[PDB]
């Protein structure tokens, strides 16, 4: 049975874009008979120059791979194997190889040939890893970032308490210094005892609050194209799910900002995530992301969607701590970027958008 | 040129594990002119019932994806192409399809094929999807878990104090109730203002407090063996870069337990970090999982490392909260876990091992 002539297979298998090679079993070593030049281009060696010998030099040095012994003992097995690992080419390049093999016996000769289609997903692999250094960084400074507005809310709505407490002892040792009673002066020790409780408790808020501010607010030269693509990985994946259409429209020419990077991300994620479940019940599901000049040489980010919108009396509390319409939502996420962008030199504010969804925009 | 026999080509095509198929071009359809077996097994359709008609019937109905697109306009241009697409074989079950198409002309007959191959990427793709998954409630927990362990510490520091002040302003009422000074009134007034605002300093304490525990505590059958994973695949990924040698040496008959979910991922994932930090700079670096079974009809969880280990005047602070050795640690890790052990009916401790490092102890 022939579907097609073998000259045809040859010619598809030649010109094929992915890397397709085979090998013939001798001992243990499995010696390269074809090579196609799609393989020839990734690894960048001659077919004249590898032929009838292993394709292991491929590893160089680098035989602290487990996929080598897994192929290994796949081949002894007998059976097929897919197997990602790390190979060099003739120039020394490091690139990553996706290489399925699979055994068959040839019982013309009675000898065991193997079929390998390789492939290149280096691209793949090093976006995979940038990913998972963004999900470390990113759990790591919302725990901090959290705990530290945790801290300072409670600060700022404990100052009134204790300094009434403080004023209130104050007035009353004036009242009583002109005082004959016995008891007095018990009463005045009593008073100061509980000032000094009150002071400690101001001392235990900061004794927190500066433990959690260990970590310092840095500011360098970034591409707002590469944050943006940062935060997106993590805050923008599974547009696909939702049915949400992405625009990027960018100006090409208002791309550098002066900005921390950990921040920027922190505050794109969380607008991110707020926008997408605002859109999770939209009819019309448009994400919008702008660049344009400001004043003082400053560059204004806008991003619009159609989501659930702001209601008339929202707007000005959407910054406020704890400010939340979310059954399971915190409120701490518009806060924390407010102060972002404060410290690094910017504005930011919100409105309403013209299709009952809602516009933020900032300024770096 | 001819390094081996199109006759030997042809048979490694037809034995390899990699679904390969070869289509010509007709206007607008590319229909199959050749399928290898491994094809026939991926999507379950005969080669004698699919042969000259396009592929795109393994979409079925699902044509909402761009990669249909993406390859469309590679074919028109005549580039090749590497996509992943959802496909469903002829029973209806669903499949990723990682598939690569090279367009090549042959110019013996002046037309155009193309060679696919094309492999099943279904299991890759839901786990990395069960990983975003994870990522994403392990973000959520994380950050409400550390604020209500922020907030409870706070409470029991602040306690003190103000009951302090409460019992002096006591004191003092009944030191002052046998006065005839003039001025006695307004201190006692002006204490009772004072007890107050002490009184409204613990409401806001519970009035956060209560708002971050906004979180059900629920206990639920599950499998330690699939606990034990997903908490592996965020905190474990990146064994081979610290060359840490895992062991799991699990036991069968001890694998349910009475457990949460989200919150044994969380104790395991933050045990999983400190055991690879703690072997970051160490010579050996292993790490063993054991279950057993223990009194009351529970299972212990055993995890040893050769880390850093514990220095004398260390194990008995381990658990207690804010304690750590780390320079940008916060030391909310161990209190947590322990809270969540105690509320799911077991215990849990340290000790030193013999290796250097340290063994950690759960009952559930
Ligand atoms: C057809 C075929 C292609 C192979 N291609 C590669 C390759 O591209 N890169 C690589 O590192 N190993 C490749 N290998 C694996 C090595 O040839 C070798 O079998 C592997 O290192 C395990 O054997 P060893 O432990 O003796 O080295 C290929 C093997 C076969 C059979
Ligand atoms: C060689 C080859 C193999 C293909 N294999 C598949 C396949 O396995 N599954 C699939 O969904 N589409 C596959 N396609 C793509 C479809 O044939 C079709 O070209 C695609 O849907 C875009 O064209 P359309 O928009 O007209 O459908 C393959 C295309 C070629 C050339
Ligand atoms: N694009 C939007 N459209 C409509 N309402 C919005 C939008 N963005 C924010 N909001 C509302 O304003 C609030 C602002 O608070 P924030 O976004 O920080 O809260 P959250 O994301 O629920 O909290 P957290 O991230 O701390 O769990 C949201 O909780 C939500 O109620
Ligand atoms: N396996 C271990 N070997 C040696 N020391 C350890 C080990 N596990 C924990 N420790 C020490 O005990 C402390 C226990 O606190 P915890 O592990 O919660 O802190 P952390 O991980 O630094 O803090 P966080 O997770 O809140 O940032 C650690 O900070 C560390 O100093």
Redesign the pocket.
Known sequence: SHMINAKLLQLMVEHSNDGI???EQEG?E?ILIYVNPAFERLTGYCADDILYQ???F??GEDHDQPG??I??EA?REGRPCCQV?R?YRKDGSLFW?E?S?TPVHNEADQLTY???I?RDVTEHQQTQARLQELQSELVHVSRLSAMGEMASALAHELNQPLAAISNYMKGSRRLLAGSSDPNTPKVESALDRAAEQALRAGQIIRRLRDFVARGESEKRVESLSKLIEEAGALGLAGAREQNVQLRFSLDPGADLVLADRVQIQQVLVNLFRNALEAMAQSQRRELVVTNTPAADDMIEVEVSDTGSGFQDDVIPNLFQTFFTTKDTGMGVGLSISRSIIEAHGGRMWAESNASGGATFRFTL
Do not use: E, F, H, K
């Open positions: 090679v085979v090998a243990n499995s292993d394709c292991r491929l590893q080598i012994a192929i290994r081949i690992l190979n190889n290489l093999i193997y079929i390998g390789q």
